[PDB]
Write an enzyme that holds these catalytic residues in place. Sequence first.
Site, PDB file in Angstrom:
ATOM      1  N   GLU A 212      -8.900  14.905  14.773  1.00 46.43           N
ATOM      2  CA  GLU A 212     -10.079  15.680  15.122  1.00 46.43           C
ATOM      3  C   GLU A 212     -10.162  17.010  14.374  1.00 46.43           C
ATOM      4  O   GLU A 212      -9.218  17.808  14.382  1.00 46.43           O
ATOM      5  CB  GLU A 212     -10.093  15.921  16.641  1.00 46.43           C
ATOM      6  CG  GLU A 212     -11.069  16.994  17.112  1.00 46.43           C
ATOM      7  CD  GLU A 212     -11.140  17.111  18.625  1.00 46.43           C
ATOM      8  OE1 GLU A 212     -10.171  16.711  19.308  1.00 46.43           O
ATOM      9  OE2 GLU A 212     -12.158  17.630  19.129  1.00 46.43           O
ATOM     10  N   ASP A 214     -12.136  20.280  14.487  1.00 46.21           N
ATOM     11  CA  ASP A 214     -13.080  21.104  15.217  1.00 46.21           C
ATOM     12  C   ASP A 214     -13.584  22.242  14.347  1.00 46.21           C
ATOM     13  O   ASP A 214     -13.014  23.329  14.314  1.00 46.21           O
ATOM     14  CB  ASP A 214     -12.444  21.627  16.506  1.00 46.21           C
ATOM     15  CG  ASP A 214     -12.105  20.507  17.467  1.00 46.21           C
ATOM     16  OD1 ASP A 214     -12.987  19.652  17.696  1.00 46.21           O
ATOM     17  OD2 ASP A 214     -10.975  20.481  17.996  1.00 46.21           O
ATOM     18  N   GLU A 217     -16.355  25.416  17.768  1.00 46.45           N
ATOM     19  CA  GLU A 217     -16.274  25.376  19.228  1.00 46.45           C
ATOM     20  C   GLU A 217     -16.570  26.819  19.585  1.00 46.45           C
ATOM     21  O   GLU A 217     -15.789  27.715  19.246  1.00 46.45           O
ATOM     22  CB  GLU A 217     -14.881  24.994  19.730  1.00 46.45           C
ATOM     23  CG  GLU A 217     -14.469  23.568  19.421  1.00 46.45           C
ATOM     24  CD  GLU A 217     -13.172  23.183  20.108  1.00 46.45           C
ATOM     25  OE1 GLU A 217     -13.189  22.912  21.328  1.00 46.45           O
ATOM     26  OE2 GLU A 217     -12.128  23.175  19.429  1.00 46.45           O
ATOM     27  N   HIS A 228      -6.823  19.173  14.090  1.00 47.45           N
ATOM     28  CA  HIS A 228      -5.894  18.496  15.015  1.00 47.45           C
ATOM     29  C   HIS A 228      -5.341  17.186  14.436  1.00 47.45           C
ATOM     30  O   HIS A 228      -6.032  16.167  14.440  1.00 47.45           O
ATOM     31  CB  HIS A 228      -6.599  18.127  16.330  1.00 47.45           C
ATOM     32  CG  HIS A 228      -6.997  19.294  17.181  1.00 47.45           C
ATOM     33  ND1 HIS A 228      -6.285  19.677  18.299  1.00 47.45           N
ATOM     34  CD2 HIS A 228      -8.075  20.112  17.125  1.00 47.45           C
ATOM     35  CE1 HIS A 228      -6.912  20.674  18.897  1.00 47.45           C
ATOM     36  NE2 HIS A 228      -8.000  20.957  18.206  1.00 47.45           N
TER      37      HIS A 228
HETATM   38  C1  LIG Z   1       8.602  31.359  25.213  1.00 50.06           C
HETATM   39  O1  LIG Z   1       7.965  30.113  25.526  1.00 50.06           O
HETATM   40  C2  LIG Z   1       6.724  29.915  24.816  1.00 50.06           C
HETATM   41  O2  LIG Z   1       5.711  30.845  25.269  1.00 50.06           O
HETATM   42  C3  LIG Z   1       4.475  30.761  24.521  1.00 50.06           C
HETATM   43  C4  LIG Z   1       3.499  31.825  25.019  1.00 50.06           C
HETATM   44  O3  LIG Z   1       3.457  31.820  26.439  1.00 50.06           O
HETATM   45  C5  LIG Z   1       3.881  29.362  24.684  1.00 50.06           C
HETATM   46  O4  LIG Z   1       2.692  29.271  23.877  1.00 50.06           O
HETATM   47  C6  LIG Z   1       1.451  29.250  24.608  1.00 50.06           C
HETATM   48  O5  LIG Z   1       1.311  28.018  25.361  1.00 50.06           O
HETATM   49  C7  LIG Z   1       0.036  27.861  26.042  1.00 50.06           C
HETATM   50  C8  LIG Z   1       0.015  26.525  26.775  1.00 50.06           C
HETATM   51  O6  LIG Z   1       0.457  25.497  25.901  1.00 50.06           O
HETATM   52  C9  LIG Z   1      -1.106  27.920  25.022  1.00 50.06           C
HETATM   53  S1  LIG Z   1      -2.707  27.722  25.835  1.00 50.06           S
HETATM   54  C10 LIG Z   1      -3.434  26.497  24.921  1.00 50.06           C
HETATM   55  O7  LIG Z   1      -4.221  27.166  23.926  1.00 50.06           O
HETATM   56  C11 LIG Z   1      -4.765  26.228  22.971  1.00 50.06           C
HETATM   57  C12 LIG Z   1      -5.455  27.042  21.886  1.00 50.06           C
HETATM   58  O8  LIG Z   1      -6.629  27.663  22.389  1.00 50.06           O
HETATM   59  C13 LIG Z   1      -5.717  25.269  23.682  1.00 50.06           C
HETATM   60  O9  LIG Z   1      -6.116  24.259  22.734  1.00 50.06           O
HETATM   61  C14 LIG Z   1      -7.531  24.077  22.691  1.00 50.06           C
HETATM   62  O10 LIG Z   1      -7.943  23.262  23.802  1.00 50.06           O
HETATM   63  C15 LIG Z   1      -9.366  23.021  23.831  1.00 50.06           C
HETATM   64  C16 LIG Z   1      -9.675  22.282  25.122  1.00 50.06           C
HETATM   65  O11 LIG Z   1      -9.076  20.989  25.140  1.00 50.06           O
HETATM   66  C17 LIG Z   1      -9.763  22.239  22.584  1.00 50.06           C
HETATM   67  O12 LIG Z   1     -11.151  21.933  22.608  1.00 50.06           O
HETATM   68  C18 LIG Z   1      -9.426  23.057  21.344  1.00 50.06           C
HETATM   69  O13 LIG Z   1      -9.723  22.296  20.178  1.00 50.06           O
HETATM   70  C19 LIG Z   1      -7.936  23.423  21.348  1.00 50.06           C
HETATM   71  O14 LIG Z   1      -7.666  24.315  20.270  1.00 50.06           O
HETATM   72  C20 LIG Z   1      -5.031  24.598  24.887  1.00 50.06           C
HETATM   73  O15 LIG Z   1      -5.981  23.845  25.634  1.00 50.06           O
HETATM   74  C21 LIG Z   1      -4.350  25.632  25.792  1.00 50.06           C
HETATM   75  O16 LIG Z   1      -3.579  24.968  26.795  1.00 50.06           O
HETATM   76  C22 LIG Z   1      -1.024  29.228  24.243  1.00 50.06           C
HETATM   77  O17 LIG Z   1      -2.034  29.272  23.244  1.00 50.06           O
HETATM   78  C23 LIG Z   1       0.337  29.346  23.580  1.00 50.06           C
HETATM   79  O18 LIG Z   1       0.438  30.591  22.904  1.00 50.06           O
HETATM   80  C24 LIG Z   1       4.883  28.300  24.226  1.00 50.06           C
HETATM   81  O19 LIG Z   1       4.346  27.005  24.467  1.00 50.06           O
HETATM   82  C25 LIG Z   1       6.220  28.463  24.954  1.00 50.06           C
HETATM   83  O20 LIG Z   1       7.163  27.543  24.414  1.00 50.06           O
END
Ligand SMILES: CO[C@@H]1O[C@H](CO)[C@@H](O[C@@H]2O[C@H](CO)[C@@H](S[C@@H]3O[C@H](CO)[C@@H](O[C@@H]4O[C@H](CO)[C@@H](O)[C@H](O)[C@H]4O)[C@H](O)[C@H]3O)[C@H](O)[C@H]2O)[C@H](O)[C@H]1O
Length: 426
Positions: A212, A214, A217, A228
Amino acid sequence: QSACTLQSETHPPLTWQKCSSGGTCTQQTGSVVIDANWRWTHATNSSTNCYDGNTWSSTLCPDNETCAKNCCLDGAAYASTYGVTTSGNSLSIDFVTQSAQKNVGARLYLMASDTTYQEFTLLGNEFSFDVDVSQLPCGLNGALYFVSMDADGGVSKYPTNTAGAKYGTGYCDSQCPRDLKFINGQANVEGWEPSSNNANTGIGGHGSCCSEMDIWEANSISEALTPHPCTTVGQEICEGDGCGGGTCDPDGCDWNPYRLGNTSFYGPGSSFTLDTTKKLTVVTQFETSGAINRYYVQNGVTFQQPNAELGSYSGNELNDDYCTAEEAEFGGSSFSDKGGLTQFKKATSGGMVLVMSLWDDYYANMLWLDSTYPTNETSSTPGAVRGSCSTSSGVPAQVESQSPNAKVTFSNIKFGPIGSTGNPSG
Ligand SMILES: CO[C@@H]1O[C@H](CO)[C@@H](O[C@@H]2O[C@H](CO)[C@@H](S[C@@H]3O[C@H](CO)[C@@H](O[C@@H]4O[C@H](CO)[C@@H](O)[C@H](O)[C@H]4O)[C@H](O)[C@H]3O)[C@H](O)[C@H]2O)[C@H](O)[C@H]1O
Ligand SMILES: *[C@@H]1O[C@H](CO)[C@@H](O)[C@H](O)[C@H]1NC(C)=O
């Protein structure tokens, strides 16, 4: 599923431009079709619903196979039921439409004929379009993107699906969506679970995965560009938890100017570089290296994607160094685990279908796009703040009640070799 004709299916026409390296653009004539999930699914021999609310008919749909045999997808009244209209090279989608039932948004695909999807090979080319996001408040997402779907909607691979692209079948994206009622010529009633907050949707035992891109958005507050990758480039079914990041990268390597630091680039009014109360042009280029470049045009002024500094990365190009720096600074390994831009180049090297939609988010209220997310994080957490919307914004029931007239308008679609779409439309 098969197709029924209690309601005739007439795809709203839509023109677009195909440009050449030689400097000229010629008008193409296509149309758009709405995704099968939005359609009325009923018995092939009557008006009895096979699906209603968020539940399937246990008699017509005891299992996935029997369901596909007994059920068909019918036509759609684009304007009166789905709030979808076109005019020349312009397409508009209303948020809430009240007919014999309440409808929220839509997902549309560009067609090449009344029975086939238009495929685009993005690598080495650029895609340009105009968009008016002025009527898109916090919580909404007017999206324009590409997915590696089959041109026929999956008919050749799954004969039990005779409706095909003419009825918007075959969707798939990097989220491996399990809310699809029909996948691979079979229903998805087996293992079905009604949504806890969406009266019209549920989750089946299977999902549909694929690459995908995008391109867009966004709403009037925030916008994001996000590739993606998936270990299986094209459409492929998934089962249960296997759909949860087993083959696809649901997070992607996202580029949101606001999230990266420039909170003055995109927003409502003259206080922003790009005034979202007015129409703007977005151009995205897919160079052969696999990197993605972006620039915008508004009122005749051109702006390259704003510069960003993240870790050891500095620049305005979405490339491997950027994506690597993002995971290092913001976190996550999904994008890289799935092959990064190298794997994604396999998708853009092949054919992808153009998708245009308008939706609100029942899972995370679109907070990931225009607010601080997760809501418990602060501005001190790298990448936490993505927009100026309140962490209390985007509740579906609320935005649907307060902003039913919200809408997005996409227009002037132009496609061709990198550097060719800025020339005169034919
Ligand atoms: C120390 O451990 C680490 O900590 C960091 C920071 O806390 C962690 O990273 C963070 O994890 C969060 C959850 O996974 C994500 S939120 C995540 O953001 C993305 C980007 O915006 C989103 O993806 C988008 O989703 C949309 C809806 O489906 C789509 O349409 C779009 O195309 C996508 O880009 C997603 O949905 C959210 O859940 C933080 O961004 C990230 O910094 C880390 O994982 C730990 O290991
Ligand atoms: C945001 O980008 C615009 C255009 O590149 C630039 O003029 C402005 O200075 C940038 N602001 C910040 C805070 O980076």
